[PDB]
Amino acid sequence: MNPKSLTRGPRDKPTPLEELLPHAIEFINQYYGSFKEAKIEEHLARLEAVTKEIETTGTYQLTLDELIFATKMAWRNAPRCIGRIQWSNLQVFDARNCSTAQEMFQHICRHILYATNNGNIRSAITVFPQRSDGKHDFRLWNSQLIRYAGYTIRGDAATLEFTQLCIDLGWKPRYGRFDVLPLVLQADGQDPEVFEIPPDLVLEVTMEWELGLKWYALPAVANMLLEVGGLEFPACPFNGWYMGNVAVLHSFQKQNVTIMDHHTASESFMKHMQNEYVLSPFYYYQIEPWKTHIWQNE
Amino acid sequence: MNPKSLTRGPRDKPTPLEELLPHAIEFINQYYGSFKEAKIEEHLARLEAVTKEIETTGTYQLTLDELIFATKMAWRNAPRCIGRIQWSNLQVFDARNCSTAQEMFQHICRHILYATNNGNIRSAITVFPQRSDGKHDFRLWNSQLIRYAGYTIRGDAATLEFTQLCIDLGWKPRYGRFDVLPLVLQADGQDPEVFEIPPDLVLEVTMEWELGLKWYALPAVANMLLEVGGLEFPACPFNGWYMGNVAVLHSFQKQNVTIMDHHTASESFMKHMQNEYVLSPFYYYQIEPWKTHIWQNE
Ligand code: HEM
Ligand code: HEM
Ligand SMILES: c1cn(-c2ccc(O[C@H]3CCCN(Cc4ccc5c(c4)OCO5)C3)cc2)cn1
Ligand SMILES: c1cn(-c2ccc(O[C@H]3CCCN(Cc4ccc5c(c4)OCO5)C3)cc2)cn1
């Protein structure tokens, strides 16, 4: 067997141009190939401009449309994702001009608001600045945007470690069982900063003859890396909606929070279908950033 | 003399509870003893929960922090390991929820990536699921994660046998002198599967007035067993870095691959020291798994 690694690690230097250029060219082809017989000239013109940009600057920037295409193809290329059948249903927020953690936070608020949509969940991805030399990475340290803390256990037992990290970073732990962990955000390679998510941004389905059980509506992956044309985006949170004695199906449907039931299955595929008139791009796992981060202040 | 065996063999049944419980209790004590006067109540509470878990399930699970502690104490307890002086410098990857060989492979890729760190080597251990009844063991059949094949001789003369085994398993032997052997991975007691290591994951120091000599940067023991509190982890690869007419010291230092020179000696001990504000646990040798494995398909 010759499987590839599903993980893409840190760098300490820019991608060598001799490595980057072939990848850039291949993606450009894939992109312009999505127009079949049309646009031969734009294709070649783009090849020339990208090549020059790389030779001049050591890298290149994607057009907005190229980025949108990339995020959708990466989704289409996600082997385990059930949602990828309707891969055209994806809203893209372009945050590649982001520079600070405060700005990252505002972008994520915007994302959570749009995708939550008061229960009528919409898929979205927010793309932060691409890796340059690898010493200025933007990363979200959370595994998901919204997750309950973990503290025997109290809360989300799978975040006991991350919860402890937040505390160590100055987060004040309320010790409930449904404490929404803060966003831990790294901009430009700096030490991460801690941001409470505004409670009003977090939609929860309350389960329904008293246990006080509830769960958050928005499942959002915070910690993967988008690869495209040799470029790496170490910060690119995205979300879908849930797949699904189970008062869940009932509580979600009764509170009208989207889940992947047959109706939603048919509808989303219907909408996807109406949007018509080594794998790359790809979402990679990363090494947990607290295991690799060099603190400029601990 | 009353030396103990440094080898821990296979089982065909779960550890008897009457054997397991005393060992579990002893480790819990060792763990909570590392807090001196504090935490008497957590200690007793943990004793009670572990005892109940064993009586209920026939075994028990370590907390993440208990596991981390165990791996570091086992290292501290390794008589021949020079690196154990700086035993607090160890990154632990928890793969105890692993179930398939493909998953094992992804964990090992992640390990190789982190520990290699583009030449700035970091110590790490990846811990796979603990032995249950002994008929579902996870094992790596390699002695190291990265090793050259052996084929008079061609390649690593010490792997002639293992190389032959890989071939017998379906591996196609390129007949060079520096062929990186594939990972041979056994999950849940199943027959092993063969996985080429992605070449880009393998860092090599090229020796430097033409012989074409090179060697791999990452020394990683693949085949030992971690014992702790009566639990056995037959799959727990770990790595350090090398100790060191010798163009080696030069080639490694000049290509900035870590070795245990005086500088690295002082630095790593310095970092270890800043991490402050029958032996058990222990790493055992095992019997070569191809000598004991019952093929459900040959
Ligand atoms: C529209 C609703 C969506 C549904 C129902 C859905 C469902 C799933 C499910 C069930 C998994 C597997 C979880 C596991 O194995 O533990 C998954 C994985 C994943 N999803 Fe989604 N997803 C959706 C939207 C998205 C979006 C918008 C993206 C990206 C733009 C995406 C990217 C991925 C990726 C990369 C993985 C990992 C896939 C792999 O490793 O093979 N998903 N998704
Ligand atoms: C940080 C760099 C490290 C260095 C320089 C180092 C060096 C060594 C050396 C020189 C040996 C003896 C080899 C021989 O006799 O053929 C050894 C053995 C060993 N090392 Fe390391 N090591 C390091 C990290 C580790 C780590 C991370 C672990 C485990 C978490 C570890 C566990 C062991 C074990 C169990 C043995 C066998 C010891 C025995 O049988 O007495 N080493 N190491
Ligand atoms: C879109 C969103 N996702 C995920 C979101 C959140 C994820 O977190 C995992 C760990 C916490 C519990 N999560 C439960 C879950 C299960 C199935 C599912 C989820 C979340 O979102 C889409 O479909 C799984 C995993 C995957 C995948 N695509
Ligand atoms: C960490 C890593 N190790 C080892 C890694 C690899 C090992 O393989 C042996 C057989 C192949 C050649 N190896 C050479 C060697 C020598 C000294 C050393 C090595 C490898 O890694 C740490 O220090 C020894 C043995 C021990 C021990 N601690």
Element housing B60 (H / E): none
Same fold, A1-96+123-133+225-239+266-278 and A97-122+137-203+285-289: no
CB pair distance less than 8 Å for A291 and B106:
no
Q: How far is A224 from chain B (nearest CA, A)?
A: 14
Q: Report which bound ligand comes closest to the CA of B237.
A: 2
**How far apart are alpha carbons B249 and A34 in whole angstroms?**
52
Q: Are B113 and A9 a contacting pair at CB < 8 A?
A: yes
Alpha helices by DSSP H, B58-93: 64-76
φ and ψ of B181, to 5 deg: -60, 150
Cβ–Cβ below 8 Å for A161 and B198: no
Nearest to A287 among B49, B102, B110 (CB): B110
Q: Are the Cβ atoms of B198 and A9 closer than 8 angstroms?
A: no
Chain A nearest-CA distance from B14, in A, is 25
Instruction: Compute CA distances B151 → A70, A75, A115, B154, B179, whole Å.
Output: 45, 44, 58, 5, 10
Going by the DSSP 8-state scheme, the letter that residue B215 receives in this structure is E
Q: Tell me the residue type at B250.
A: H
Using an 8 Å Cβ cutoff, are B62 and B228 in contact? yes
Q: What's the gap in Å between B96 CA and the centre of ligand 1?
A: 23
Which of A5, A152, A287 faces B198 most closely, judged by CB atoms?
Answer: A5
Name every chain A residue with its beta carbon within 8 A of the beta carbon of B117.
10, 292
Contact list, A285 vs chain B (CB under 8 Å): 110
β A183-186/A193-195 pair status = antiparallel
The one-letter code for the residue type at A228 is V
Report the residue from A1, A9, A292 with minimal CB separation from B194.
A1
A9: nearest CB among B105, B114, B193: B114
Atom of ligand 2 nearest to the CA of B79: 41
Ligand 3 pocket check for A240: Cβ under 6 Å = yes
* B126 CA → ligand 3 middle, Å: 24
* Distance in Å from the first CA to the final CA of chain B: 43
Structure tokens at A241: 């909606």
Q: What tokens appear for B31 in the block? A: 């763990």
Q: Given the DSSP bridges, would you call strands A124-127 and A91-94 parallel, antiparallel or unpaired?
A: parallel
Domain B1-96+123-133+225-239+266-278 has CATH 3.90.340.10: yes
Give the architecture (CATH level 2) of B97-122+137-203+285-289: Alpha-Beta Complex (3.90)
**Overall resolution, Å:** 1.9
Strands B204-206 and A193-195: unpaired
Name the structure determination technique. Answer: X-ray
How close is the nearest chain A Cα to the Cα of B142, in Å? 16
- With breaks defined as C to next N over 2.5 Å, after which residues does chain B break? 151, 208, 209, 244, 277
User: Looking at ligand 2, which atom is closest to the CA of residue B239?
Assistant: 27
- Give the single-character DSSP code of A1: -
**DSSP letters spanning B224-250:** -EEEETTEEES---EE--B----HHHH
Shortest CA distance to B63 belongs to which of B22, B94, B20?
Answer: B94
Please list every protein residue whose CB sits less than 6 Å from any atom of ligand 2.
Answer: B 71, 75, 78-83, 90, 123, 125, 238, 240-241, 243, 260, 283
The tokens of A68 are what?
A: 């949108």
Q: To the nearest 5 percent, what fractions of chain B are helix, strand and coil?
A: 40, 15, 45
Collapse the DSSP code of A160 into the 3-class scheme (helix H, G, I; strand E, B; otherwise coil) and give the result.
helix
Record: contact A6-B49, CB cut-off 8 A: no
Residues of B with CB under 8 A from a CB of A: 45, 49, 64, 91, 102, 105-106, 109-110, 113-114, 117-118, 193-196, 198, 201
Shortest-distance ligand to the CA of residue A225: 1
Of A239, A217, A219, A232, the closest CA to residue A285 belongs to A232
Q: Is the CB of residue B161 less than 8 Å from the CB of residue B151?
A: no
**3-state secondary structure string across chain A:** CCCCCCECCCCCCCCCHHHHHHHHHHHHHHHHHCCCCCCHHHHHHHHHHHHHHHHHHCCCCCCHHHHHHHHHHHHHCCCCCHHHHHCCCCEEEECCCCCCHHHHHHHHHHHHHHHHHHHCCCCEEEECCCCCCCCCCCEECCCECCCECECCCCECHHHHHHHHHHHHCCCCCCCCCCCECCEEEECCCCCCEEECCCHHHCCEEECCCCCCCEEECCCEECCCEEEECCEEECCCCEECCECCCCHHHHHHHHCCCCECCHHHHHHHHHHHHHCCCCCCCEEEECCCHHHHCCCCCC
Are the C-beta atoms of A77 and A152 separated by less than 8 Å?
A: no
Residue identifier of the C-alpha nearest atom 8 of ligand 1: A81
Contact A159 CB / ligand 3 (< 6 Å): no
φ and ψ at B205, to 5 degrees? -90, 120
* Distance in Å from the first CA to the final CA of chain A: 43
Rounded to whole angstroms, the Cα distance separating B171 from A178 reads 50
